[PDB]
Design an enzyme around this catalytic site. Structure first.
Site, short mmCIF file in Angstrom:
data_model
loop_
_atom_site.label_atom_id
_atom_site.label_comp_id
_atom_site.label_asym_id
_atom_site.label_seq_id
_atom_site.Cartn_x
_atom_site.Cartn_y
_atom_site.Cartn_z
N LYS A 1 13.11 6.43 -11.67
CA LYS A 1 12.84 7.72 -12.29
C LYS A 1 13.81 7.94 -13.45
CE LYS A 1 13.41 9.98 -8.63
NZ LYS A 1 14.12 9.39 -7.46
N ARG B 1 23.74 6.83 -11.48
CA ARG B 1 24.47 6.39 -10.31
C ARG B 1 25.68 5.52 -10.62
NH1 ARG B 1 22.74 6.77 -4.95
NH2 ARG B 1 20.60 7.57 -4.64
N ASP C 1 -0.39 0.55 -14.18
CA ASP C 1 0.69 -0.20 -13.54
C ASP C 1 0.77 -1.64 -14.04
OD1 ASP C 1 1.46 2.00 -11.96
OD2 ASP C 1 0.19 1.40 -10.28
#
Ligand SMILES: CC(C)(COP(=O)(O)OP(=O)(O)OC[C@H]1O[C@@H](n2cnc3c(N)ncnc32)[C@H](O)[C@@H]1OP(=O)(O)O)[C@@H](O)C(=O)NCCC(=O)NCCS
Ligand SMILES: CC(C)(COP(=O)(O)OP(=O)(O)OC[C@H]1O[C@@H](n2cnc3c(N)ncnc32)[C@H](O)[C@@H]1OP(=O)(O)O)[C@@H](O)C(=O)NCCC(=O)NCCS
Lengths: 402, 402
Positions: free
Chosen positions: B94, B101, B166
């Site tokens: 996302k 992080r 996709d």
């Protein structure tokens, strides 16, 4: 040939022969990313894409245009001289048409042993008499691969649109050519690639077809844009318009059932603890899930659904129409749509270069070239004299700027 | 890691983190072509693809499976040690979730300065607060890009199926990573790539949208699988079933009009000499062309139409259902569908490697690996001791073979 130094593919030399979408899409993607790309058109007639009023300004930008009869006498010799300085050649034909006319892979490699050759065809470079030499466009590849039969509504199959199979095939060609190029660096020898459009689309259509090939049944087509197997997936109506959603994940399913009035279904034989997906046909509660989902959504505006789904980590989006794209904040922020100048000096609008390379971004440096525009420049750069090129034009074997 | 030497990408080392289709499709295409590909799954939960009964045997074949907590303490250190020997890292998240992080591109490059990093997301690595961090699947990308609104019948939009966006996004990632890899050889420095799914699909949807962005109008959706603008293009009925056709070209149009009883239309203001395409809306005779075309086709069997169209060089094909694919002579001749063994020792059926590289063909050498299967092998190969890996398993930071 005069052009700026940019992108990951700066200094790479690419040539393509083919018309419309698939072949040229493969070739032009190299040019988006910095390569020197030569577009070969025939002498007497031009690429059929030129009949489209606006699209070619995008699909042929950053290109050099050569117009040459690559199969006839001095045209052939000129083409094979060009191949000596060419790293990648993309060709789109009816099966092994190049080999049939005398230009085999072995002939090409005699002029350039390191050359990467990508053959794009409807049905491949070999097979049966019945199919191998047949012409193909997008819809032909969709029909022959089982892709068309999977698209559309329950009672009405239809192709994926626009020209979906052409883009997949062109992209596969680009990817394979780059993979082979990597091998040439590490082995010093050329490669030949046989890309059959139907084999490309066969791969893109396997998600449910793998069940058929392995004991199971083939899925049905979507009903009004809802996933044929999984509840909470696909197109839905809110109070004020269409959205899409994907109900996937343990947490997402638990909180959404709670919201729609179905909390008691959690922990039943077909929806046990840890369920990531609800199968609308295997579960007896499938149609009920859809019934309550539809009713909950119809109570809310798109904006309200988006906020609640943002709280639950459920992917969703308003279905946008074309007029809504330019002024979308994400499009604006990323410059997804930009402007450039055509060769004739007019302002053209369309998508920017994609994707975004951090260190070596691509750029738009040239609009779509005219028929035969760079012929005299390309031939001179491979050893041809002014009078020698004049004879190629006169003999009907080449065309220069209009 | 033990594996055969094959394909154009032999000796290349690829790692991917992502689930479902897009990210893993990009990574696994490397493995089809010879690369050493490591599939990273989380520790506590596995890739959601494993919920599909058969497809993963195809979409995860030729892979090594690592199960590791790439963000926590010793898991993080182990992941960054792996990056030192990695050429390409594909990550699907996302937005900029990796950077958020603590694993930025600069951090990754401190461990490997030549590393090619491909970030796949729904909405990009940057933009607005509203969109950048949103989750995305195929339908979300179709909705946000104007692709969904172009698919379906006149009165009913629907996504292209199955999971079309996709595959395009995954393929774009593969292509871009290979392009950046070429630059690393020629510059000795790594690259970062920002692939936003909606930008990929925006490009694939431009054929008619370019008219809207440049003064014109947007086309309608297809009516029952017929091209919205061009007559003689798309899905038609014969006496005994569905075919597709593309009426394109000067000669094709002249001979087909002659056949259907419309020869007198040739050489009129809107169908002048040399017409390559008939525009169903700009030409007053458009609907008449369709009316006579439909009636001529309904008089003939598929086989008869095919033979006459073979005489005219008009591309066409019978629309095949899934049960008709295995025994088609072209499929058989080219081995388009083959068989291989799963890890558990069962025979699996599905598409062969595509495309066909002449000198360095790909091959299927391994079935889909189990969750955590190669963890102990991968960690040992990067300097970890048996007891040191035992502590990673115990601390919940890694998982080994079941
Ligand atoms: C698209 C396609 C149907 C058009 O083929 P076509 O109807 O024969 O039209 P073309 O203009 O390409 O070919 C006319 C002839 O000129 C030849 N030709 C092509 N470029 C030439 C050049 N630069 N110089 C001299 N001759 C040339 C071709 O080989 C062909 O002769 P052939 O029958 O011996 O093979 C065909 O090329 C094809 O099936 N390609 C593979 C699939 C594909 O790319 N589809 C398009 C996706 S949008
Ligand atoms: C598919 C997608 C919606 C799933 O995201 P999700 O709902 O958060 O589920 P995940 O299992 O991937 O993520 C759970 C968390 O574990 C983390 N995680 C992922 N792999 C991990 C690993 N190996 N070790 C430790 N943590 C990991 C993720 O970063 C995430 O935390 P975050 O919220 O701080 O970013 C999301 O990854 C996405 O939008 N990807 C981009 C588009 C895409 O690839 N779509 C799929 C096409 S089929």
């Amino acid at each position: 040939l005069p052009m700026p130094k940019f992108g990951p593919l700066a200094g790479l030399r690419v040539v393509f022969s083919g018309i419309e979408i698939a072949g040229p899409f493969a070739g032009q993607m190299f040019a988006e990313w910095g390569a020197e790309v030569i577009w070969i058109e025939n002498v007497a007639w031009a690429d059929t894409i030129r009949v489209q009023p606006n699209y070619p300004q995008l699909s042929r930008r950053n290109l050099h245009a050569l117009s040459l009869n690559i199969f006839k006498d001095e045209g052939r010799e000129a083409f094979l001289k060009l191949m000596e300085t060419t790293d990648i050649f993309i060709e789109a034909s009816k099966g092994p048409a190049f080999a049939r006319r005398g230009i085999t892979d072995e002939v090409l490699w005699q002029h350039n042993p390191k050359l990467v050759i990508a053959h794009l065809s409807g049905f491949g470079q070999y097979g049966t008499e019945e199919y191998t030499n047949l012409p193909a466009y997008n819809t032909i590849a969709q029909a022959f691969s089982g892709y068309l039969i999977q698209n559309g509504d329950v009672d009405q199959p239809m192709p994926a649109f626009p020209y979906t199979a052409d883009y997949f095939s062109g992209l596969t060609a680009t990817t394979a050519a780059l993979a082979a190029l990597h091998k040439v660096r590490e082995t010093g020898k050329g490669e030949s690639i046989d890309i059959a459009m139907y084999e490309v689309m066969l791969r893109m259509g396997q998600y449910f077809m793998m069940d058929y090939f392995n004991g199971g049944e083939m899925c049905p087509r979507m009903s009004k844009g809802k996933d044929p197997y999984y509840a909470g997936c696909g197109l839905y109506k809110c109070a004020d318009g269409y959205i899409v959603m994907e109900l996937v994940g343990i947490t997402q399913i638990e909180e959404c059932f709670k919201d729609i009035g179905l909390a008691h279904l959690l922990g039943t034989p077909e929806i046990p603890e840890g369920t990531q997906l609800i199968h609308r046909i295997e579960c007896p509660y499938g149609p009920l899930v859809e019934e309550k989902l539809d009713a909950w959504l119809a109570t809310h505006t798109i904006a309200e659904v988006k906020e609640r789904f943002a709280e639950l980590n459920i992917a969703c989006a308003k279905v946008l129409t074309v007029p809504e794209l330019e002024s979308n904040p994400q499009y604006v922020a990323r410059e997804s749509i930009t402007q450039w100048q055509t060769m004739d000096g007019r302002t053209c609008k369309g998508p920017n270069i994609m994707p975004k390379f951090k260190n070596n971004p691509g750029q738009i440096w040239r609009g779509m070239p005219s028929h035969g525009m760079d012929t005299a420049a390309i031939l001179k750069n491979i050893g041809y004299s002014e009078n020698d090129i004049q004879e190629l034009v006169s003999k009907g074997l080449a065309k220069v700027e209009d």
